[model samples]
Target chain A: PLRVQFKRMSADEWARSDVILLEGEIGFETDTGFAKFGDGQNTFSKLKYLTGPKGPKGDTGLQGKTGGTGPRGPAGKPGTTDYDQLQNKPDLGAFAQKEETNSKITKLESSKADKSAVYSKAESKIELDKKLSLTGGIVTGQLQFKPNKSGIKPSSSVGGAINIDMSKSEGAAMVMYTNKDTTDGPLMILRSDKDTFDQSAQFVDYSGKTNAVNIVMRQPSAPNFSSALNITSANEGGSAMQIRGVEKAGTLKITHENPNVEAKYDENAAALSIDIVKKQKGGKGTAAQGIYINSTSGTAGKMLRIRNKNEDKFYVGPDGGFHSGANSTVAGNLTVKDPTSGKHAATKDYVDEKIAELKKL
Target chain B: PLRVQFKRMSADEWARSDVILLEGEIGFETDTGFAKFGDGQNTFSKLKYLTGPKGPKGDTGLQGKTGGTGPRGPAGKPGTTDYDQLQNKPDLGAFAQKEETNSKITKLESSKADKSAVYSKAESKIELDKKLSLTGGIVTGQLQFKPNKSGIKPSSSVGGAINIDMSKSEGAAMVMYTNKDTTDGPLMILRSDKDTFDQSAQFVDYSGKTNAVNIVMRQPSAPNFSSALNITSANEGGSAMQIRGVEKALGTLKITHENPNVEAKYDENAAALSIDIVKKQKGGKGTAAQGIYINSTSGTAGKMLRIRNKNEDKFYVGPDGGFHSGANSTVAGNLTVKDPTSGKHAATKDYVDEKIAELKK
Candidate 1:
């Protein structure tokens, strides 16, 4: 009989043992090995020895406790403002300082009037009324003129008008007229107004079978001579004189005594009409005549008249040739008829209908 | 002064002169030229010259006459007609000759005897005692079966019963049966009856399997052993057995047992049933029990059944190497389960939900 004593041993003691023994009866055999039988199979093992002492009670395990939540860190410093936030800031101190310095410099400069002092002394010493002597043929000041009480003044002591005869010459004289002092005054010619002449008056003489002269005024005078004056001679080298009336007369007339021509002037119409009459005996012919007229207003109107007094009738032919019939009548409108037929029939009408239609369009 | 002679000349004679001599003075000169005095102011010198000799008169011209009008032409002939117009005409004589020749030739050439004379003759001389032979293996003709008493009989001694056996095996047959030699007999099978053995017992085995013996009946009570005997076997290869008391059999009894595991029979309620039991216990740790049920009378009502039993507590396990506990079920009206899983609770539930959803769909 074996009495067994059981002692509690460490794991290290059990591991140091050479062999381990178990005391229990085997239940049943299976294809793999033996297994104990039980209502519900359970497995177990026993050993005679234990392993060495457990390595010094393993480090004490730390018990984890729920941590207290840390206070939220101070909120980070707020970021600096953006550029737009500081855009409107003004440099008030700098602006004020600049304005003060500018005003002080201006006051200091204004108090020192040395330039103004020199200008004042020089101004006081100068005399405005002192006369200046002009020398060396140089004139420095303007000439002065005073209005005269009389409308006309003498240009020179020679009172008689100079008659520059241009009966046989090509050019006449250009005369200049001025007041007595001969300084800065209206100039005029002896027989013309200032408006009708330039600084000088020009006279041109063109002599041909008709001896004529042209007087031109460069400058016209106000009120008296509204336009420049021009005078032209109308004598034809023969002894015929043409006369122009004064301002009151208002009519220029010409007279001719030659038996070959007749002249007359109409005052109402300001025209001169001329007529030529033939004196030769028993010659069937027509006379040619021409007339000219001039007015102070620069207008001239003239007329030409032709006349023939004979028994023969005048006719223009188709080829632009002319002929006279032996017997014809010249009545209200100068009608020429063929003597054979004693008829007054016209060959062609002068008016063209096509030309008239074109003018209408 | 010279005394001038005045002589008047005719205008025509004067116009014929070459020149005229004037003796009077010419006067009245104007801007254009000197004017001439005369009845006619201007004339050409040649017109005033001397006269010349005259010529004779010319012959008169012929007068023109008017022309006569022409006559009108006749009208043109009519155009030809087309084939369609000719056919639509009421008279058929225009096309009849051509149509008759073509139609007659077509009919003669297509006649049955002319095209298949040899085949027709062979068909007509065939002996009725032999089975009907077909051309090109195609049989399309009326089959006349006389009663067994007739001298003309089938060479196989089975007559139409041969078709019955083939119909039973193939599950479809069309044939006619007769009791007399009369030409008129009821059309059997008429493509109206259902093509299956369980519909009617017109040709069936006494043991209730679709077999050859059931196709024909033996002559009524000829002898106990000398009657015409039918030999049949079960469809699945087994010896045929007799049914001793088919009339007294109750409820759904099976008459044929082919394999120890499968049976076929006719039932009063079910008509016919073919059952197959498969044993799957042989080669592995897992086993399965399966069956195939053929409800022969129900047309397409056949199904397979499978059941599996494994040693694991669950049908499947997890990677942790332990059986999972769950109930997994899959059912469909026409169910098909491809890969099944039965492990964790969640997986089993997922499979069950999938199967249920499929059923709803």
Candidate 2:
């Protein structure tokens, strides 16, 4: 049998000394049951505490007679309730019924819009300015146009309150179709105060030619070749232009003042003729159906004449008298009425012979 | 004490018996040491159970010694871990940090619209149709009016592409203003194809009196009263209408060809009114137009045209193109006279020259 020996020291003394132990050496402390094992390089203080293998667990003692229910715990401070006593708890009965609040919340929810239906402020503005579309049938009331308060028209080029722009149209700018009376057509009127109308005469044409009212037609494709205006009269002898005088039938006369010319259709003579009305002293004249020439302040004599550039070639008096400015010749018969009278127009041969006879006498 | 004989039965038989016991009597079951006492009118089964009192007390036993600790238990089967050996637990390490999710939730809450600020679907519609009002300053974009694709105008009476009706308004329907220059104002134009314009003469007023345009004001409170238009020019002698030799310049009232090949403008210039017909770049009918044509239908002998100076008729022209002065007697040129025929006509220049030659002879 071998007896094992181990070094023993009080823990205090062993801890106080900085001593080293050999490898695999054990040191026991007498004051405490603690033991230490060392390696060769370590001092006793640095050595690990030696621990023995753990012992098996002891059997548990039998639980005593359940301690007779703990003597009822001395009635447990008058057997307090499971919960802490509360002070000043409000009465929940006064609150509204759960069902009623839920009902109100449901109504509010029903009134609200779907998430997709609502537009944000920015989106609303974009839709209003650029994308608002309304059906034609939606409006049944009268439409009103209001002038700009600042006196600035909405659009500068087309500034009317109600503007219809067909500026780029290939068709008509506007068209009106109706099934009503033929005489029912577009009408335009100017309504003004009597005083305003009196003063507005300045707007009228002082010169009769500048007509205040004008009906215009577009130009033709070719220059001056096409007709700007045309009228089709279904009846025979229908006049294209007619003027009725309400003031006095005969007083309302149409006059062409310049180049005083007379175009007369004589019902009696059964002839249509244009007569030179102005007494022509010198200037050139136009001839239409008949020719007429006259001197200033003259009777109906010498009404027909042929002249070559300011030279009188021939003349015929209203009384059937004919004369030539240069020479005269009768190819067939030479007849003269009142040949004895010197006042009558005679042939140049007769006048020469008469002068010779008178000289011989 | 007197010994009392009680009714006896087997326990099962006594329990089943329906017999009544005498007053101060008992019913006993012999199989067990039990008895029943009864009053006079009770059945044996209805009696109370009876027992005799105990006689003597017993001595107490001494307390037992504490038991020795049981043999050391075999090493407890390697002490089990505490948490029931958790299984299939998720690796919460991969989950989002609590702070990060909370921060995201906070951001989302902030982005949601405020309950008071948002509008419901019904409210949105009401505001759009009836209560929409935009600041004039906020609108900078163009407002377009597009024609209906269904060929229906929005309102029948005011059926233009862009309609603004001010029938109920007491003020002007529209106004145009500019600060840069007074002359810079509104412009309206209609542009159409050449072919379309060529066949559109029916729109013109052939009678030339019924103007095709109208600028209308509302009917006055009274009949035929109130001013419809007013113009105030800052400078004296500022004319309202203007016409120039160049056709492109605007007039107060103008109707022109689509391309303006010919423009007839009524202009008041130099204290006189005149219709100035201006021609432009090519492409039209031949530049020939008829002046005023007149016909007198009656023979009442009224003059066709008359010239007056301050209400005194100075000159007159007859329908036959005869001219006469109210009072005149001067002639710079000599008058030719016919010969002294039967009507004593004026003498002619030829007759005078002949007589002078004869006198010289």
Candidate 3:
């Protein structure tokens, strides 16, 4: 066995340095050596290739456990040109509960009697529930939305609010409520431009309570009420808070049934003042729709002798009062008593004088 | 080819069971069997309303793969805004030969017959030695720019990088050596600007190995010179490696012509004292520029001195100087010597005295 060491040299020098090529495989054997590449136990540490080609694809195994869910990604844009295409979609739920068809694999007829039995019915229900859950339908308590077992979700899961668009059904978002007068069919719709929603306006927001079902609508960062809970009407139109009686005509009148407690127009007056009149009541008035001044006794049907108010000839409606210096008021009748020598002074002042003279006579 | 096994009540029991019924006729079969689905090639996993009026379009299909590559997307944004419209593109290797029009593809008369050749002699020169390569107009050992096909290029199928942008042309980049100023139209272009490669600034580069030529201008990234090997001006802005001259008046002037080493200004002076009343030469001795001084080894002259450096009446021009206190000397007229012994009362006792009188006379 020849053991030799060589001096370091330039690459070219090294090239020729290895010229000691032997004609055949060395039969040199010393029980000990620098070791062969693949020894009985030693394996390759510096293989040019780490591993070998992969084995063939084996038959499918029972499914592996699914992956742990990852963070939710941002919501994406709509799939249709617009979401309106829902109208064109096949209503699977609507059809599934009715037909009887065979299974593709068995060819056996197996359809449901109605909503529960068929596969499509179940699929349709799951799908619809998902949609309803996403929309506000489940937001209503009656839907029994259960976030626990995967049903109607609690409000928090939906961030206190959910919006369902009826725009797909009606031309816009307006809805009609009362059966008969389908006019401005609305149920508390708080919006920016329902018409106060103006350019002078800015934003909208809804803070709703899930359990109490209390919903507050407003223009979130606006400078005035005009931008918030404000109620406004359409162009050139007026807004009204009409409280009407459902059963009768003219039932929605200005006042309740009682006269004293009521507010009415002062009818049968020469001037047209639809005064909010009150009849004598609360012991503050005579029966007519004006203030009453009676003798020391707070009695009924009593009237004042001569009005002593700063507004002598006064006109009053509800809490409003005014004195008409130029407008004269001749009471339907007048009587005034004097503390002087036994007499009625207003109408009989001269009579009182005549009586005194007669006594003299 | 029998593939059947059964144990069942009517469709009712099968109703809860496999109940797979393949009703259509099966003419016959080969010995090996898929055999039939009726008893059960497969069981009905479940049934569906496979047959029913179309259902509402089910929810959107998993969002589709974003629309196809489509037309090579609308033309992309510009690489650089000004680059958007390549107006200032070079006037293509300033015409070396006779070509009526500019090159279409590159927008240059661009086919400079040679690198410097077209603009050089009509740096336009085409000589086909072995292969034709236009890398540089000279195309080899030259430009040391070349287009010679086989030279250094890896070879065909692989178009080479011997590129000379007609883009890199202009006559001033080189000169005839015989010399006459080759002035191309230029403005006093003083900038807070250029090597942007304005006409006023010029120079190019190449490190030829031919398959090689690295163009440089102000591509500042280089180690020494900016790509625009430009020798620029000042007050007249921009970058430059200015060199100057020594003589005066147009000697080196604002710019350099052909000169050697020089400096920013001049060296020293003499009689430096009151450089006052300064004139050109100390004596062009009938003088000129260097220092103002006379030959110290006097061939002729006279001296006027009260040489007393003891209690010195030393002169100064501005650092006062010395005078010899006791030394011998003669007047221009004559010499008088006295060796006094007791004031020399002898023969010419008056000789010292008479000499003094003679000096006065």
Candidate 4:
């Protein structure tokens, strides 16, 4: 057993050495207690340690007394505020309360009136434009009906009539115009069609207790002057005109162109008297003549009898003969009837006989 | 030696012994390889294992590999919230139920009218004031109609006509002045623009009855009265008035004229248009008390009136101013001519006596 001596080095020296070992050599480090076995071709540096693996590490040193708690760690990022632990959290105060706002909307919808029924200024104006045809419950205003035009008389083509039909009812259409002064005009005028004279007008004045109808007319220069008054009767017995005195007999006086020469009939006298106040100017010899009468001849008791106070004194017989009881003289020629043998006297023959006797004597 | 030997026993007995080790003495135990060197007054229980004094504490072991994490600690009490768990959380700042509120608003809007389409009371009042409806509208102010322009009469074109058309049936066409009190002017004035009387007012009544006049005008009271009715034609000699009763005599008529030229003639040869006497009153019986009376107050010149048939005069005074007849003459009374001196005059009673005396001679 000849054992070769081992080379020994400090661990530090071993780490630093690059020495090659002969085959089958051992290298040891005194301080580390590590040894290296070398192969013939390897340097000691390349050799692995022969020391056992390091003993398991000693139990961790009892944790050093908790290092005096380290300066309080940077205040850890403030832990998220615990939802539950938070106090005085912000709220949604700025928003409208959903329930309350909804209620108000409901009220507004329910309470509003229909747009059609309620009066709207613009809509109502449109309605008023049709007022002429539209009816209302009560109208309190002066009503004026305008025609298509003015200044023209109403007719089928020119103007339209203002019609008020009261035939259905008994009520009379009445108009009262009063309390106006100092205006002159006919109260009413009734104009008629050109061809018909059916339209008539009457004016009654009860204000003066007397009944009088005064008609005044203007005489036009033209020849077509209608009579101022005309009375005509188509009936057999009806009088064209009749005049009567209410209390006494009436007097009819016809005044002539010559005021003095007028004819009058006085009911008091019951006589027709023509009073020619002046005497006959030149007796009937002149153009002026007096009264005249006519009669047929040979009628019973036909005679001309001159009477004084209703007693006949003389008569002109119906046979062209004259008789009288009163004395008479003829200023002109006088003739008498010739007598028959037994008839009373007074014939031209008797006078001739007397004259012949007178001539024979 | 004696003391130690005395305590020496089998390892089991020695372990069991509580005997104190003597000072400067050692206690040994076989099998355990332990000997206790005891100090005087120390019990065996205090003896330590047979070991060297704890060498200076070995160096701290290397840090152990980090230990695997321990199972999660029993879940901590459920945390109040997870910062990450909250997804799409509604911000309290904005309303959370906005969609719901918006829906409600849409419904409310549908029920209301457009603001501009509705009328406000303030503006509507004025609009209504200008409108006058057919019924139920009261106007407190006067109503006036102003022409479109001056000098133009009312016509369908320039001035709208006031049309009242009721020609269809029996109806009162119109009546003016329903409601009014006092006025200073004429109640109704229709002024005519020209003297020709072009502008006119007219009323037509179709009722035909003798007593029922178509129109009636009542006069205002005054001692000095104007003519009740005057129809004057501006042209010369125009008829002042006219009346017609086509089938019968017109009602009684009376008229007066300053310069009258009256005529009564018939259009029909046989038609009798004559004046006759009526009973004293409307109901009295008529008598023959009728005649003519004439008076010539200022008698100067007037030809004698004559009566004749279709041909010639029947009776008249002769050219000598003597009465004569075309046919036989009949005098109901004596005829005398006063102061006869002409040869044509009739003889007197004296002449008759002389004629008789001559006969006696």
Every candidate's lDDT: 0.25, 0.38, 0.22, 0.38
Candidate 3, residues B1-361, lDDT tens digits: the string is 2222222233333335654556431111111111222432435333321121333433323433343332322333333223223335445344332222112213322331223222221111221222222222121221111122222322222222221111222211111111113222121111112223212211111211121112111111212311111211122121112211121111111111111112211111101011111122243222111111211121111111121123453321100111122233222221112233443111122433334445453
> What digit string (tens of lDDT, one per residue) describes model 2 on residues A181-240?
224333322233332222221121122222222244343233232222222221112221
Q: Every model's DockQ, to 2 decimals?
A: 0.00, 0.02, 0.00, 0.04
Please, what is the TM-score per model? 0.10, 0.29, 0.13, 0.30
Give a tens-digit lDDT track for model 2, residues B139-241.
2223333343435342324444544333333333323222222222223323223332333211432222233343433322333422322322212222322
Using lDDT as the measure, name the better of candidate 1 and candidate 2.
2
Candidate 2: what's its TM-score on chain B? Answer: 0.33
TM-score of chain A for the candidates in order shown = 0.14, 0.24, 0.19, 0.29
A141-197 per-residue lDDT for model 3 (tens digits): 111111222232222112211222221231211121122222222222221212111
Model 3 chain B, poorest ten-residue lDDT window? B267-276
Tens-digit per-residue lDDT, B195-233, candidate 1: 231221122211111121211112222212221122222
DockQ, cand. 1: 0.00
